[PDB]
Design an enzyme around this catalytic site. Structure first.
Site, mmCIF file in Angstrom:
data_model
loop_
_atom_site.group_PDB
_atom_site.id
_atom_site.type_symbol
_atom_site.label_atom_id
_atom_site.label_comp_id
_atom_site.label_asym_id
_atom_site.label_seq_id
_atom_site.Cartn_x
_atom_site.Cartn_y
_atom_site.Cartn_z
ATOM 1 C CG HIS A 101 -1.904 1.090 1.388
ATOM 2 N ND1 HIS A 101 -1.614 2.306 1.428
ATOM 3 C CD2 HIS A 101 -3.431 0.905 1.089
ATOM 4 C CE1 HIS A 101 -2.839 2.955 1.349
ATOM 5 N NE2 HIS A 101 -3.707 2.132 1.259
ATOM 6 C CD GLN A 134 -7.511 -6.359 4.635
ATOM 7 O OE1 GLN A 134 -8.364 -7.308 4.744
ATOM 8 N NE2 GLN A 134 -7.639 -5.218 4.480
ATOM 9 C CB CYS A 170 -3.892 3.148 -1.842
ATOM 10 S SG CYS A 170 -5.149 4.593 -1.599
ATOM 11 C CG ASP A 229 0.649 -1.966 6.203
ATOM 12 O OD1 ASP A 229 -0.306 -1.835 6.943
ATOM 13 O OD2 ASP A 229 0.614 -1.285 4.842
ATOM 14 C CE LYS A 242 -8.226 -2.244 6.128
ATOM 15 N NZ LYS A 242 -7.646 -2.413 4.651
#
Ligand SMILES: Cc1ncc(COP(=O)(O)O)c(CNc2co[nH]c2=O)c1O
Ligand SMILES: Cc1ncc(COP(=O)(O)O)c(CNc2co[nH]c2=O)c1O
Lengths: 414, 414
Positions: A123, A203, A363, A200, A226
């Site tokens: 991302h 997600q 993105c 990261d 999220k």
């Protein structure tokens, strides 16, 4: 099979409405998640009963607000199995968390010859801060290549990471491919070469158990919006020894100890990295979202999404002229394209059927270029989604292909 | 006299409760403000009905979320009379706004010999970022002296600001002294010397009309939580020509246009400065708070607070052994000390009476040293406060002084 999807959906008021005369089918949770009543009512109770500024020492409401804020911090620590609350920093989101790592760690530990290693599937939040850090330090940015199925092989990691690599930044789960990356093994590889690993986890955190001690990640970033939590809230986890040597990214009140005319000293962790009045209500609501997900069980949510993903992959393979990107083993999302139909048109037509998906580059423009596409459509799932909604999605895709096909064949005879 | 304080208090559920067996008397709005039902129910409606990620182009809920977010931006622009929505940047608060100015403007426009000019009354949010910027650039930090009553004379501004001054950073209203600084005249002085002016408006925006075109401020920072809005939200206003030449402070998705492997281009204003998923619900709720305050009328709120302040000053002057700091003409707050009683004890005793005030340095340690004190107590007012609550405060202060006085005289005879 323990979670009851009906009882779960009952707690999300936003799901029970119609769009364009059709029952809402929300398949855009990778963009943002919906909230249960527990979270919304937590925000309500905060603003109705004990809102006040925090890090008190005095009046009653202020003590209650501080207790709520720091208790949410402890909830987060337990949730990701961090060793200490000093390692849990509240931020405004994953992007800010990664930017803090890039400014306070990268720009202070990078010299010419050093390497920052990322991947083609990242991302933008896990790309641009590193671009700017290597530009400011004169270091080098490198990319780990991807397999043909959108996965990362450990041999490619070992080839890309060298003794000059100081930072490896990688996504836990790709918001486009659904790939779950081998974060633990990559952390071992990065540490073997003298690098730290930044994960990261925007997600991954909403959909699967996170254990930062088992992952041995040096930094880990996540977003509240999220994972059924309020917007504008996120977390930066960092190993405590690393955070101790990092300078703050923001300066002001609450993060200082002594303030002179020209020099100042900082508070201990974690408050050193929390300048100004903090995100009090949002952090308390993120704690409530954590309580909600934990009561349901992250393993149960992951199993539900594994079934949803397998069902969706099978039913997509029943559609002609549809290409799905990424590996078979995946998180709960499907990114795809219809033959000869732009994904924005796909998503418009689907919204006319009440179905919410996302079209575009998500993105991840370098990944789109790696896929040799300009844009894609994406349906992403969460704990409130069902196989019936996937049936509606695949039926609407079949109807979209038929509609475009024969308006083409209509006015090619014009 | 148009606002009905009873009807206004009716809309704040948090005011209608008891603390320690006494009706709550909340006099800590300079620390944070309470919220009316309009704001809380705005957050509720967002999470219940149209939450989705923004800057859409596709599904219906996403369009509604984007419309709400950007409509809140326009509400802010109108509220402070900015020329353009490109000049309104949503941040997480005043502190972050000022840090963005310090990183993206100051550190790029400061060389050895340049001067950053601030004042002795500044909040830490308007001190530490400038300390760090002058340290990183080798520039010089200077302080405008204060008059004996805690005001700033324009002659001292002209003496401190020189042809080498490039930035003047100053508070619109002091959270400690209640001083309203002559921001317009100081902006004229700064521009006459070739400097820009950065205004810390965290304490002014909630309580008085802001007109950035009349003030001619180059930057202006504000916090939602102090003006009946959600926590974790703030605004940075900057003149558009200045924002165009400033590089982003954060990098990632949403703020980019094209993303290559090593280089990227940024979006136009204001989105260039908004990286990652934004503070959607909080910004919409800040728009609702603006609607609320505008329907009441900022001039009406300012007049109410002027009366509250005059009443409080008079009644404080009726107390023996109490020192009040700052000028007679002031915003709606009183910072004080009881003779021979530490302000933390004052505030504890007052909380036992249900009264919420703040004790400490109020994030203004250089000001405390200028006042020759270690700490102070502060009662701050807003649109829901009444003269009866001020009566309760002054009675509790009299009772505090009596209690401490004669426990002293009791056990000095021990
Ligand atoms: C993997 C990953 N990293 C970073 C971010 C961004 O973090 P945040 O915006 O600061 O909360 C997202 C959000 N992903 C998406 C947001 O909208 N569509 C998406 O795929 C993400 O999925
Ligand atoms: C004048 C002034 N500037 C900056 C800030 C801080 O901005 P924020 O924290 O980022 O919303 C405050 C908050 N003042 C106070 C906060 O708690 N007690 C106070 O006096 C302030 O009053």
């Amino acid at each position: 099979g323990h979670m009851n999807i009906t009882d779960i959906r009952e707690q999300f008021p936003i799901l029970h409405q119609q769009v364009n005369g059709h029952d809402l089918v929300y398949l855009d949770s990778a963009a943002t998640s919906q909230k249960p009543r527990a979270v919304i009512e937590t925000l309500d109770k905060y603003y109705n009963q004990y809102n006040s500024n925090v890090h008190r020492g005095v009046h009653t409401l202020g003590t209650r607000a501080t207790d709520g804020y720091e208790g949410a911090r402890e909830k987060v620590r337990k949730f990701i199995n961090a060793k200490s609350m000093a390692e849990i920093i509240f931020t405004k989101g994953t992007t800010t968390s990664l930017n803090m790592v890039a400014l306070s760690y990268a720009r202070a530990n990078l010299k010419p010859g050093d390497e920052v290693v990322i991947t083609y599937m990242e991302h933008h939040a896990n790309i641009i801060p590193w671009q700017q850090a290597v530009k400011a330090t004169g270091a080098t940015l490198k990319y780990i290549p991807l397999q043909e199925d959108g996965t990362i092989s450990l041999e490619d990691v070992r080839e890309t990471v060298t003794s000059n690599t100081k930072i490896v930044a990688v996504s836990h789960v790709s918001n486009v491919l659904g790939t779950v990356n081998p974060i633990k093994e990559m952390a071992k590889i990065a540490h073997d070469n003298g690098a730290v690993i930044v994960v990261d986890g925007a997600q991954s955190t909403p959909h699967m158990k996170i254990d930062v001690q088992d992952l041995d990640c040096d930094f880990f970033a996540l977003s509240s919006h999220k994972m059924c939590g309020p917007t504008g809230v996120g977390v930066l986890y960092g190993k405590k020894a690393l955070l101790e040597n990092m300078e703050p990214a923001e300066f002001g009140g609450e993060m200082i100890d002594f303030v002179g005319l020209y020099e100042s000293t900082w508070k201990e962790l974690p408050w050193k990295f929390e300048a100004g009045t903090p995100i009090i209500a949002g952090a308390i609501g993120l704690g409530a979202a954590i309580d909600f997900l934990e009561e349901i069980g992250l393993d149960e949510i992951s199993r539900h999404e594994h079934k949803l993903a397998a069902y969706a992959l099978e039913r997509f393979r029943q559609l002609d002229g549809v290409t799905v990107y990424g590996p078979e083993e995946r998180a709960g999302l499907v990114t795809f394209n219809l033959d000869d139909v732009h994904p924005h048109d796909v998503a418009t037509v689907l919204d006319a059927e009440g179905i919410a998906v996302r079209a575009g580059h998500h993105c991840a423009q370098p990944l789109m270029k790696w896929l040799d596409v300009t844009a894609t459509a994406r349906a992403s799932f969460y704990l409130y989604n069902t196989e019936e909604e996937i049936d509606k999605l695949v039926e609407a895709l079949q109807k979209t292909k038929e509609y475009f096909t024969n308006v083409f064949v209509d006015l090619e005879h014009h």
